[PDB]
Amino acid sequence: XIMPPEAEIVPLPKLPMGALVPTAYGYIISDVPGETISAAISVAIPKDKSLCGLIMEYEGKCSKKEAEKTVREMAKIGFEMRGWELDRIESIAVEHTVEKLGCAFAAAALWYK
């Protein structure tokens, strides 16, 4: 997940080493050579600013585009369940092709400005 009301999506700040950062994340690890794995994160933003944003996570043995498409739909669904007016959805995705043992990771880090 949940983006607090009036929080802003900004590029990753300079975080003190060892800081305890509340983070919503999705990850997947595979030891199968040649297997493509992906992780994605989406943040649904409300039209009503007094409401909170919704953060969804996704991971699976698929492509980056499929993962991003899936995670954005999940965020959409979250807003429909709440009956809230959706402003837009921000997202990020990554895919990895396992050489021997690999991990794909996507996250939404919450911090303080």
Binding site: L20, F105, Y112
Partner: protein, 46 residues
């Protein structure tokens, strides 16, 4: 401020990364590093 005020997080940053590793944990650590958040303690939210 001379008196610390309680507050909820006010920034959200989207990062992503991937990595190869000798074990599952080392691969995960590598992905965090590739994502630019490998040297902080992640408190997973649900």
């Amino acid at each position: 401020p001379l008196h610390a005020y309680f507050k909820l997080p006010n920034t959200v940053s989207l990062v992503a990364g991937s990595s190869e590793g000798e074990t599952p944990l080392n691969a995960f650590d590598g992905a965090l590093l590739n994502a630019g958040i490998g040297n902080v303690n992640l408190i997973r939210i649900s």
